[PDB]
Ligand binder design. Structure first.
Ligand SMILES: Clc1cc(-c2ccncc2)c(-c2ccc3ccccc3c2)nn1
Ligand SMILES: Fc1ccc(-c2n[nH]cc2-c2ccncc2)cc1
Ligand SMILES: [Zn+2]
Length: 333
């Protein structure tokens, strides 16, 4: 076992191995807290996340397990992965804190306007990561700029997969459709790409209602083919009761942008999710001709999510998480 040292940073106790030095607070979301640090063993800059109250309830315990399982499975250059995972606890009985470690990323996409060349590379990387994620039957569901880490080199990694946000959400979701597919993520990517090209949020709704109205203004109210797939009687009334609007001409709305970028946007921002382009198909779009390499856009190993339907005690989830910490084997340097 390694030697741990303790310190207090921002009213948070940090107890980690000696190998990680010079902890410095980066930010504190609700998920947990993060510090940048230096890993003496590898000479690398890393980010260490300390989970907040990981076993405070069934919800939290299952969430802690879900995140650890998912992070241990993601091995892709465009998806945040695990360099290490540890606990100061020496037994299950004492186990109450979880620490996750990954490569330190200097910024996010919100912190940029961009050349068409930079938009191509950044969206390319997002899709390449999504292809991998989607291949494992995982859906991100909350893609947005702040979930995309980027370094000075413009290398990008997707954070918080399968774990206003409303601005990047697919319409089927705030219609409360409970059978949405993986292309909910493609809608988000389309919102992101548009914003990188124009420098403006595409659909800055103030609430769920307004958000839908901004969306239909651009892509038009639903056609009869899409109307037939809506079961909710409520949803139909609301939708059919709206002032029917036509799909706008994207070449006009995004006038000045690379026509190839416009073509892709049109394929991503389709109201009917069954017609949206997939990540794999998007990667082969002529817009990414300079980066697309079919032999270097890998898929993931099968991912076992059966635990999602289990109803267990906090201690059972806690125990399962303990097991995942112990069985962890770091990736080759
Ligand atoms: Cl908004 C945000 C940023 C980071 C982060 C910041 C800087 N560099 C890398 C990540 C992590 C974060 C920080 C540390 C992590 C460690 C292991 C697994 C995931 C992790 C996620 N979460 N959320
Ligand atoms: F106004 C809209 C906006 C989006 C949709 C939609 N797109 N893909 C799936 C749906 C959908 C929404 C609600 N119920 C079934 C299907 C349907 C109507
Ligand atoms: Zn480089």
């Amino acid at each position: 076992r390694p030697t741990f040292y303790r310190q207090e940073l921002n009213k948070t106790i940090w107890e980690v191995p000696e190998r990680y030095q010079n902890l410095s607070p980066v930010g504190s979301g609700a998920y947990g807290s993060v510090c940048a640090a230096f890993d003496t063993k590898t000479g690398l800059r890393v980010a260490v996340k300390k989970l907040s109250r990981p076993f405070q309830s069934i919800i939290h315990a299952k969430r802690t397990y879900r995140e650890l399982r998912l992070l241990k499975h993601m091995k892709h250059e465009n998806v945040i992965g695990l360099l290490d995972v540890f606990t100061p606890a020496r037994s299950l009985e004492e186990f109450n804190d979880v620490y996750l470690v990954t490569h330190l990323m200097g910024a996010d996409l919100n912190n940029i306007k961009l050349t068409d060349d930079h938009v191509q590379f950044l969206i390319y990387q997002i899709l390449r990561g999504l292809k991998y994620i989607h291949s494992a039957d995982i859906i991100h569901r909350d893609l947005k700029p702040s979930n995309l880490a980027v370094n000075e080199d413009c290398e990008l990694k997707i954070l918080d997969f399968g774990l206003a946000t409303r601005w990047y959400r697919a319409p089927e979701i705030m219609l409360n459709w409970m059978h949405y597919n993986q292309t909910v993520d493609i809608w988000s990517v389309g919102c992101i790409m548009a914003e990188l090209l124009t420098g403006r949020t595409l659909f800055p709704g103030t609430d769920h209602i307004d958000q839908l109205k901004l969306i239909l203004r651009l892509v038009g109210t639903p056609g009869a083919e899409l109307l037939k797939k809506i079961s909710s009687e409520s949803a139909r009334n609301y939708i059919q009761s709206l002032t029917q609007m036509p799909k706008m001409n994207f070449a006009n709305v995004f006038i000045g942008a690379n026509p190839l970028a416009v073509d892709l946007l049109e394929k991503m921002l389709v109201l009917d999710s069954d017609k949206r382009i997939t990540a794999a198909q998007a990667l082969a779009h002529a817009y990414f001709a300079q980066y697309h390499d079919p032999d270097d856009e890998p898929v993931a190993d099968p991912y076992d999510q059966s635990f999602e339907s289990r109803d267990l005690l906090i201690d059972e989830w806690k125990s399962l998480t303990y097991d995942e910490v112990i069985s962890f084997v770091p990736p080759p340097l």
